[PDB]
């Protein structure tokens, strides 16, 4: 589509990240109000407590929600319907900026202050550090079925990926990025990036050597992106306190 729609969230303040689950429920981290809200396919506020500028959210097939609680250097999780949040046994995080979960329940976090990406396997209590190199203030992460990890390397204006069990980081052929802030990948392998400083969302179609600019209009400093099964793209339009979607 070429016409966006604005999602009917209310009272957002600098939304920072967005996730969509298999039933089309949209979750948003409302950075300026220290909360996470959700809209089923009238918003609901999830029962997190003591969040400090939440920066990213991910949701798995069971409906468990994970949030990077940036100002408290931690990752918190709510199981579906649960009333108590759990702090995950990550250690050493500094200003965590984003989170993604794969089909296996493995949790990946961009550890922005430490220029690294860390992961916690499902059923594991000990994190591992991924062998990215040269990151600077990584801002977002996405993971696909293959277990390939994509990261927006915000401080170097680039997007990098790491294949599963590999020592090989690939720089994706995006062009002219300015503080890329979020990344999403769809089942076809298409990669979508929010280009924060250029007020645009770009996309590298699977197989393509050059990026395409999605037809959003009016964005201001977009901060995060999620894609669903049907290729609908959701973007947190941070500067306008709103969330937009494009079919």
Query: What are 134's two structure tokens?
Result: 């040269």
Tokens of residue 59, six digits = 């949701």
Residue 181: other Cβ atoms inside 10 A: 26
In angstroms, what CA-CA distances link 85 with 67, 89, 158, 207? 10, 13, 34, 41
- Dist CA 17 CA 55 (whole Å): 6
Task: Parse the chain into domains and list their residue ranges.
Answer: 5-246
In angstroms, what is the resolution? 1.8
67 touches 54 (CB < 8 A): yes
| Residues 9/242, Cβ–Cβ less than 8 Å | yes
Cβ-contact 53, 72 below 8 angstroms: no
- Please say whether the beta carbons of 59 and 67 come within 8 A: no
Closest CA to 48 of 62, 61, 63, 29: 29
How many Cβ atoms from other residues are within 10 Å of residue 220's Cβ?
A: 13
Rg of the Cα atoms in the chain: 16
Q: What angle do CA 9, 3, 197 make, to 5 degrees?
A: 70
Phi first, then psi, for residue 106 (nearest 5°) are -70, 135
Stated length of the chain: 247
Which method was it determined by?
A: X-ray
DSSP state of 64: -
C-alpha separations of 225 from 90, 130, 164, 208 in Å: 24, 22, 23, 20
CB 187 within 8 A of CB 229: yes
DSSP code of residue 186: -
- In sign, the C-alpha dihedral spanning 58, 38, 181, 231 is positive
User: Could you tell me how far CA 35 lies from the centroid of its own chain?
Assistant: 16
What's the token pair of residue 141?
A: 């992460």
- CATH top-level class for 5-246? mainly beta
124 Cβ contact partners less than 8 Å away, ≥ 6 residues apart: none
Side by side, the strands of the sheet bearing 15-20 are 15-20, 26-30, 35-39, 44-45
Rounded Cα gap, residues 217 and 185, in angstroms: 21
């Amino acid at each position: 589509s070429n016409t966006q729609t604005v999602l009917p969230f209310t009272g957002l303040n600098k939304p920072s990240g967005v996730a969509v689950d298999s039933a089309g429920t949209v979750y948003v981290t409302d950075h300026g109000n220290n909360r996470v809200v959700k809209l089923a396919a009238t918003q609901t506020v999830l029962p997190f407590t003591g969040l400090n500028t939440p920066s990213g959210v991910a949701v798995d097939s069971a409906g468990t929600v994970w949030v990077t609680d940036h100002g408290n250097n931690r990752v918190v999780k709510l199981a579906a319907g649960s009333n108590t949040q759990t702090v995950l046994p990550f250690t050493g995080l500094n200003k965590p900026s984003g989170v993604a979960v794969d089909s296996a329940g493995t949790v990946y976090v961009t550890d922005h202050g430490n220029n690294r990406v860390v992961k916690l396997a499902a059923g594991s209590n000990t994190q591992t550090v991924l062998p990215f190199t040269g990151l600077n203030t990584p801002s977002g992460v996405a993971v696909d079925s293959a277990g390939t990890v994509w990261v927006t390397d915000h401080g170097n204006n680039r997007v990098v990926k790491l294949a599963a069990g590999s020592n090989t980081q690939t720089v994706l052929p995006f062009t002219g990025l300015n503080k890329p802030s979020g990344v999403a990948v769809d089942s076809a392998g298409t990669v979508y990036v929010t280009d924060h400083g250029n007020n645009r969302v770009v996309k590298l179609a699977a197989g393509s050597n050059t990026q395409t600019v999605l037809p959003f209009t009016g964005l201001n400093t977009p901060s995060g992106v999620a894609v669903d099964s049907a290729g609908t793209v959701w973007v947190t339009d941070h500067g306008n306190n709103r969330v937009v979607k494009l079919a």
